[PDB]
């Protein structure tokens with residue numbers, strides 16, 4: 390039973406009242422008894438919502454729209470759709486996530502027999518495809534009369550702009566009502582076709598599978614789905630009266646969780662808004678914030694929030710501390726707010742400052758249930774906006790929501806705008822995060838993130854501060870030149 | 874009336890006798906109950922003189938002659954020639 394005493398407990402580490410951040414300490418290693426792949430990353434987002442992975446995309450206009458949210462839900466986490474856009478735009482982005490299904494086409498392009506072949510060529514050059522079904526109305530939920538594709542069009546000269554060419558319903562292969570992707574794989578295997586339309590018992594079109602998107606099928610075991618098996622989506626909302634309308638559209642779009650978005654969440658405006666939400670939409674889960682101290686947390690927890698977002702001025706793009714002298718170092722803040730919130734069963738989100746895998750493991754060890762990343766997920770294929778080149782390298786634009794560029798679309802800049810280098814894809818990079826989090830938990834000695842926090846609260850997890858010198862030595866040093 | 878205690882008071886912050894400057898600390902946020910425009914900046918310069926804003930131009934030969942002093946007074950502060 391004797392384990393020699395070596396290191397500080399988390400309570401002793403934070404008892405000197407220095408402003409510690411993630412880089413100021415290290416976690417001491419424990420006793421390995423299991424492989425890194427055995428580590429369970431299951432995480433509470435709110436009082437009722439549980440994820441299979443701790444990771445969250447930040448509600449920022451350069452990070453999180455429906456494609457980022459779909460990629461994050463599928464990889465095991467969740468995404469929060471930003472709100473620097475019209476209420477109807479945001480509800481449409483949520484509705485795209487909530488009505489996504491794997492291998493099926495989302496929001497199909499469709500035409501009618503009175504359209505011209507020129508409409509197929511234009512929908513190509515603005516979308517990039519041409520396998521477009523034909524219906525009696527030209528819309529959807531309407532009789533499937535035939536299909537048009539590039540091999541129906543490719544030998545027509547520019548002399549010809551005929552009305553719809555169309556191979557008719559009598560010749561099609563279709564699915565009858567709704568199918569698992571195995572029956573779709575066998576229909577597209579046995580038929581050699583590029584599309585599989587899906588119809589109703591009354592022969593309306595209702596969905597499509599493309600052969601290309603079916604061939605790109607893969608397993609998603611951590612899919613992060615609601616009770617009706619649709620992906621989880623969150624959305625951000627403000628605290629003004631204009632937000633009460635937006636909140637209704639997001640509710641109709643089927644949003645699962647709302648995150649009230651402020652820099653200082655301990656206001657009368659946010660408490661009013663939380664009481665309004667819990668009294669109008671009692672099914673809806675609310676994350677308040679941002680808060681850095683336990684007194685802010687206490688006000689919001691009495692207001693009835695289901696989770697807290699923790700952070701103020703630690704963000705990569707942030708300059709709030711330099712202009713208003715208000716904030717807290719992020720390690721200290723995460724520890725204190727999470728310790729207070731745990732007395733009520735409320736999970737917190739450690740939001741901001743994350744740059745490495747060690748920062749994620751450190752934040753999770755200090756009591757955070759989930760981790761929100763802006764810059765770490767920015768410049769992926771799934772992030773909003775489009776790439777550009779400068780100094781011979783691919784970049785994407787990343788900006789603070791209180792930067793002048795973000796808020797112009799007397800006023801004080803709380804944030805900055807700048808470049809981030811291309812990361813590739815969420816579907817390829819989130820696995821690097823998950824594998825690194827699991828190996829860090831394995832070196833620490835925790836078989837799950839729940840056990841990690843339980844070891845930290847009981848004093849079994851030990852810590853160690855770092856001088857400047859120890860941070861220098863913990864880097865790369867003494868080399869002439871080296872690889873990334 | 875319970876407010877959880879989190880952070881140092883100004884007396885505890887300066888009780889360790891380090892040489893702190895402005896960049897060495899932060900102020901912790903409180904409880905908003907009013908809009909930013911409602912904040913009163915009225916300030917005592919001396920035992921008798923009160924300004925409507927805390928700002929003063931330094932008495933330096935590259936900062937404050939009569940035009941700087943006029944602008945500073947008009948904007949709410951004062952200047953020292």
Ligand SMILES: NC(=O)c1ccc[n+]([C@@H]2O[C@H](COP(=O)([O-])OP(=O)(O)OC[C@H]3O[C@@H](n4cnc5c(N)ncnc54)[C@H](O)[C@@H]3O)[C@@H](O)[C@H]2O)c1
Nearest residue numbers: 628629650651652658679700701702704709790791803909
């Ligand atoms: N790291 C951070 O915590 C941090 C720091 C700065 C900005 N931001 C981000 O910038 C964006 C803008 O947020 P913000 O910081 O401007 O705060 P905000 O938008 O919540 O509020 C801005 C100002 O309007 C006031 N206000 C809000 N609701 C009001 C109401 N109903 N009636 C009257 N006044 C009201 C606030 O008190 C504040 O003075 C958000 O995306 C936010 O997350 C985040």
Ligand SMILES: Nc1ncnc2c1ncn2[C@@H]1O[C@H](COP(=O)(O)OP(=O)(O)OP(=O)(O)O)[C@@H](O)[C@H]1O
Nearest residue numbers: 494496497498517518519520521522539599601602
């Ligand atoms: N009618 C459609 N509506 C919406 N998206 C579509 C439609 N047809 C194809 N797509 C999408 O376009 C992408 C490429 O599909 P596909 O390979 O089948 O293109 P295509 O229709 O054959 O066009 P092309 O002849 O130019 O290659 C896939 O993601 C697919 O889901």
Ligand SMILES: Nc1ncnc2c1ncn2[C@@H]1O[C@H](COP(=O)(O)OP(=O)(O)OP(=O)(O)O)[C@@H](O)[C@H]1O
Nearest residue numbers: 520536538539540541556560561562582583584585
């Ligand atoms: N589900 C289907 N059932 C029957 N015929 C179909 C079906 N889908 C496409 N067709 C028809 O099959 C032919 C080939 O279309 P398909 O989508 O398979 O290839 P394409 O996209 O036109 O050609 P390619 O892949 O070479 O670019 C066209 O005449 C088209 O109208």
Ligand SMILES: O=c1[nH]cnc2c1ncn2[C@@H]1O[C@H](COP(=O)(O)O)[C@@H](O)[C@H]1O
Nearest residue numbers: 704705707742763764789790791803804
């Ligand atoms: O303009 C801004 N100023 C201050 N903080 C911001 C701003 N925009 C976003 N943030 C915060 O930055 C976090 C992301 O930080 P990052 O992961 O370090 O890039 C977000 O979740 C917000 O809390």
